[PDB]
Amino acid sequence: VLSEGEWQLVLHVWAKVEADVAGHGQDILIRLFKSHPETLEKFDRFKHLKTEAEMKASEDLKKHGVTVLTALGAILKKKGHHEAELKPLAQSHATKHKIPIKYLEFISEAIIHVLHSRHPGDFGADAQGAMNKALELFRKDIAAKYKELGYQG
Ligand code: HEM
User: Fold this and answer.
1) CA geometry: angle at 125 spanning 124 and 128, to 5°?
2) 149 CA to middle of ligand 1, Å?
3) Distance (Å, whole) CA 143 – CA 127
4) What is the fold, at CATH topology level, of the domain defined by 1-153?
5) Is 36 annotated as a binding residue?
6) Is 113 annotated as a binding residue?
7) What is the rounded CA–CA span in Å between residue 23 and residue 9?
8) Domain spans of the chain, in order of start
9) Scanning 49, 61, 65, 118, which has the fewest C-beta atoms within 10 Å of its C-beta?
10) Which residues contact 30 (CB under 8 A, 6 or more apart)?
11) 122 Cα–ligand 1 center, Å
């Protein structure tokens, strides 16, 4: 359970992200795909991209990055009371997209790295730990829906 102070740290940085949702989403998916290439293989949409320059030039990858971050933003702003917003994300990610929990750990590391790069003054260690805790709570609650559905592993 995050504390109110920890939520304030999370959403203080998140408000900085919302000024350039698309640039953040490009940098986080690129980082994800370069750091963990198995992840790129899950997107039929993107698996033609073979260099980071091709990734950076894809408008469709930029579009999906905004989809991802808008969904995550709507979850963080519920401060833990996010059951309505995860149901559908867990259902589609487990049963249609086939994404293992560990790849949600990987995109969480990429989100944390990009935020540190772009917002160091609002993303010191207190805010890094709170955001870690927020992303762990996301993964915990998604893992429980996976497990219901027979996909936790
Ligand atoms: C913060 C974590 C994430 C969030 C908030 C998120 C959000 C979304 C949303 C809102 C969609 C479109 C609606 C839907 O299908 O449910 C989506 C689609 C999809 N996601 Fe995620 N996602 C996350 C992580 C991942 C990860 C780590 C992967 C792959 C490794 C992945 C793979 C996909 C795929 C394959 C689709 C369909 C893309 C297409 O072909 O249009 N997602 N995601």
Assistant:
1) 90
2) 18
3) 24
4) Globin-like (1.10.490)
5) no
6) no
7) 21
8) 1-153
9) 118
10) 52, 55, 56, 61
11) 27
CA R_g for the chain = 15
59 C-alpha to center of ligand 1: Å?
16
Nearest-angstrom CA–CA distance, 101 and 80: 19
| Resolution value (Å, 1 decimal) | 1.2
C-beta 92 within 6 A of ligand 1: yes
The CA-atom distances, in angstroms, between 63 and each of 10, 152, 153 are: 24, 29, 31
Please name the residue ranges forming H helices in 1-124.
4-17, 21-35, 52-57, 59-76, 83-91, 101-118
- Rounded to whole angstroms, the Cα distance separating 14 from 19 reads 9
Is 117's C-beta closer than 6 angstroms to any atom of ligand 1?
no
Q: For the beta carbon of residue 54, count every other beta carbon within 10 angstroms.
A: 12
Instruction: Identify the experimental approach.
Output: X-ray
Structure tokens at 66: 């905004």
